[PDB]
């Protein structure tokens, strides 16, 4: 799974250990080994949410399965909670797009997961 | 909706008020309330379009509905127009990927839209 | 087609010519003229893969068709090879997501490709 967060929060406000925390919580949430979890945080962005430049985030979670109605509600509580606690972003200024990827459509290690 | 523009145009060439203009025009075009429109502009990128490093852009528009053949043509005229007027990017050096998101696959405010 | 690479490798480690090499090889691989290939490299990112911050990459390849099981295996061999040779990224620390776009969902030149 791959989790990406783009935010207008500055780099200095991203705590040491945040990528490691996301890796662990995402492994737990998705049930996938942490060795397969990729995380990417992009601070200092030029962004607005509802016209406003108050802290906000646009995110994505891509996974081969483990994506669905109940699972995605659960992920959103988890991830919005982490963004609120660690980056001081209000959950109502976060979008997370969930993508259920086909294994044939994910490249890794010179081949695909199919 | 969420609109992301990645461009090799430098930051200093992005005019003041650009994120607000995007937010407004996208609310009008999509019919969505402006409080739900998110916008993200990423200048100074290392990019090429058709092998050339002349001004170009790669963009995305994600929306829960309001995506389709005619609607996307209309969006592209609006958005290419704005990139041309405000960033001086030729419309023929812009790609815009459109995504119709299922409500269950968009997280916001600790839950999803489903 | 549009190919995006996000990496923690620093900007100074991206060799001269790399966007052109990508453009050329992708044109050959996809069969699309190079005039229609866009490439975007994003270095110096805050990323972890499998819990560690050795060189890694998260990439995407969007194309109108020319996406499928065998094709995508072939693209991954090519692209992981290039990231290994030019950026010194181990192919087991690369994910590439492949998107088969509908022509009506790709904006260009004030309209769509439909």
Q: Are A111 and C83 in contact (CB under 8 A)?
A: no
- Rounded Cα gap, residues B16 and B36, in angstroms: 21
In this complex, do B109 and A97 lie within 8 Å of one another by their Cβ atoms? no
Residues of B in contact with C38 (CB under 8 A): 47-50, 56, 58, 95
Q: Are C107 and B91 in contact (CB under 8 A)?
A: no
For this PDB entry, the determination method is X-ray
Q: Are B97 and C106 in contact (CB under 8 A)?
A: yes
Q: Does B110 touch chain A (CB under 8 A)?
A: yes
Sheet containing strand B111-112, edge to edge, reads B111-112, B106-108, A94-100, A57-63, A2-7, A38-42, C46-49
What total number of domains does chain A contain? Answer: 1
**Taken in order C9, A55, A62, A22, is the CA torsion positive or negative?**
positive
In this complex, do A35 and C47 lie within 8 Å of one another by their Cβ atoms? no
Q: Which residues have a Cβ under 8 Å from the Cβ of B58 and sit 6 or more positions away?
A: B5, B6, B7, B47, B49, B94, B95, C2, C4, C38, C40
- Rounded Cα gap, residues C110 and C108, in angstroms: 6
Domain that holds residue B43: 1-114
* Closest CA in chain A for residue C43: A42
* Closest CA in chain B for residue A8: B40
Residues of B in contact with A6 (CB under 8 A): 40
Q: Which chains touch A (3 or more CB pairs under 8 A)?
A: B, C
**Taken in order A36, A109, C5, A95, is the CA torsion positive or negative?**
negative
Segments of chain A assigned E as strands: 2-7, 38-42, 46-49, 57-63, 94-100, 106-108, 111-112
Which CATH number characterizes residue C69's domain? 3.30.429.10
What is the token pair recorded at A24?
């662990």
Residues of B in contact with C112 (CB under 8 A): 69, 72-73, 76, 98
Q: Does B106 touch chain A (CB under 8 A)?
A: yes
Q: Are A28 and A20 in contact (CB under 8 A)?
A: no
Compare CB distances from B62 to A69, A97, A100 and report the shortest one's residue: A97
Which residue in C87, C3, A14, A105 sits closest to B47, CA to CA? C3
- Strand B94-100 versus strand C106-108 pairing type: antiparallel
Q: Resolution of the experimental model in angstroms, please?
A: 1.8
Compare CB distances from A111 to C61, C73, C100 and report the shortest one's residue: C73
**Pick among C6, C49, C82 to test the A interface (most A CBs inside 10 A):** C49
- Residues paired with residue A111 on neighbouring β-strands, in sequence order: A108
- Rounded Cα gap, residues A19 and A5, in angstroms: 11
In this complex, do B34 and A51 lie within 8 Å of one another by their Cβ atoms? yes
Q: How many residues does chain C have?
A: 114
In this complex, do B67 and C23 lie within 8 Å of one another by their Cβ atoms? no
Segments of C43-110 assigned E as strands: 46-49, 57-63, 94-100, 106-108
């Amino acid at each position: 799974p791959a989790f990406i967060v783009n935010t207008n929060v500055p780099r200095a406000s991203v705590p040491d250990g945040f990528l490691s925390e996301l890796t662990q919580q995402l492994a737990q949430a998705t049930g996938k080994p942490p060795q397969y979890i990729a995380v990417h945080v992009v601070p200092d962005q030029l962004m607005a949410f509802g016209g406003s430049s108050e802290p906000c985030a646009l995110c994505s979670l891509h996974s081969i399965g483990k994506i669905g109605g109940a699972q995605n509600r659960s992920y959103s509580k988890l991830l919005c909670g982490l963004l609120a606690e660690r980056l001081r972003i209000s959950p109502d200024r976060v979008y997370i797009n969930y993508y259920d990827m086909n294994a044939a459509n994910v490249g890794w290690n010179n081949s695909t997961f199919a």
